[PDB]
Amino acid sequence: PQITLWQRPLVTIKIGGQLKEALLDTGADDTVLEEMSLPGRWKPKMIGGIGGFIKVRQYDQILIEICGHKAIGTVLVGPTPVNIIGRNLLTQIGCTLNF
Amino acid sequence: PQITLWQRPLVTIKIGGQLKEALLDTGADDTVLEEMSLPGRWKPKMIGGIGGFIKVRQYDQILIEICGHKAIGTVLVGPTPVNIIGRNLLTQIGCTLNF
Ligand SMILES: Cc1cccc(C)c1OCC(=O)N[C@@H](Cc1ccccc1)[C@@H](O)C[C@H](Cc1ccccc1)NC(=O)[C@H](C(C)C)N1CCCNC1=O
Numbered sequence: 001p002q003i004t005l006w007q008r009p010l011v012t013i014k015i016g017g018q019l020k021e022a023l024l025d026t027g028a029d030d031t032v033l034e035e036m037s038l039p040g041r042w043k044p045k046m047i048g049g050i051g052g053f054i055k056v057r058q059y060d061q062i063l064i065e066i067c068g069h070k071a072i073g074t075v076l077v078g079p080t081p082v083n084i085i086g087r088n089l090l091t092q093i094g095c096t097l098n099f
Numbered sequence: 100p101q102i103t104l105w106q107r108p109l110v111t112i113k114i115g116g117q118l119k120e121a122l123l124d125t126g127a128d129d130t131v132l133e134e135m136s137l138p139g140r141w142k143p144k145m146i147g148g149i150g151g152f153i154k155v156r157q158y159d160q161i162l163i164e165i166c167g168h169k170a171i172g173t174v175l176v177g178p179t180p181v182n183i184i185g186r187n188l189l190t191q192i193g194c195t196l197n198f
Contacts, residue, residue: 003195026122051150054150096104097102097108098195
């Protein structure tokens with residue numbers, strides 16, 4: 001679908017048998033989600049945003065269902081203020097910026 | 100122009116008689132540019148990010164020619180790693196998220 005930006009591009013995703021709301025972020029290289037229970041092994045990692053860095057856990061091969069569309073990629077779990085759909089996932093669902 | 104997301108969507112902007120490159124961030128309510136000099140006056144303001152809060156100077160009525168498109172709005176300047184064109188401006192140039 002088409003999304004104007006007069007409001008935050010929030011959409012509903014399905015992950016780990018759970019439902020959430022993630023922001024479609026072209027400004028994000030990766031995908032980071034609020035602390036949640038996820039099965040499988042992970043790997044420590046650090047990402048640097050505007051306010052600084054945060055200690056997140058790196059999950060590979062995690063299936064996410066963005067607004068219906070199913071995709072699988074690397075999901076980061078940490079102390080983020082909002083759920084973020086980064087370009088690693090956005091390019092799988094074919095999201096494009098236009099104007 | 101249609102922009103895919105395989106790489107960070109960098110756009111060439113022109114502000115204060117200066118040329119720069121800014122990221123089209125759909126996950127940014129406002130626009131924050133790196134440290135630079137500007138004519139108008141400002142007002143201390145802080146914004147929440149991923150790793151914490153930074154203090155920026157606010158400016159209203161700032162002309163910005165985003166990739167051949169002239170728009171005007173509130174710009175913020177501070178300790179931001181990259182230049183960011185948020186939604187307060189993206190809408191002015193009819194930028195749409197699509198998939
Ligand atoms: C939310 C907001 C309100 C008012 C004004 C502004 C500028 C606002 O946005 C601030 C902000 O942190 N926005 C983020 C999403 C956001 C909204 C609300 C709360 C917290 C975050 C996101 O869009 C952009 C920001 C840009 C960036 C900054 C420094 C270095 C590199 C990239 N991107 C990142 O942090 C990403 C993360 C998410 C994987 N990131 C970090 C590792 C390297 N690459 C990368 O892409």
